[PDB]
Amino acid sequence: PKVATNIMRAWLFQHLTHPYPSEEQKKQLAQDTGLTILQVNNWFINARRRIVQPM
Ligand SMILES: [Cl-]
Numbered sequence: 001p002k003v004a005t006n007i008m009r010a011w012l013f014q015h016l017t018h019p020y021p022s023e024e025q026k027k028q029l030a031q032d033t034g035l036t037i038l039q040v041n042n043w044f045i046n047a048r049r050r051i052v053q054p055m
Pocket of ligand 1: 009
């Protein structure tokens with residue numbers, strides 16, 4: 001699971017100005033992580049919320 005998380009973190013940091021994977025990108029991320037598309041989407045929702053959450 002560390003590799004799965006690191007796959008998504010790496011994508012996220014490379015796309016900080018638009019941290020919203022397209023449908024095709026979600027599909028590739030699912031393949032790379034071994035997570036479902038649903039899990040990939042939920043991870044990104046939670047990541048974007050974490051970035052903006054108050055100190
Ligand atoms: Cl990282």
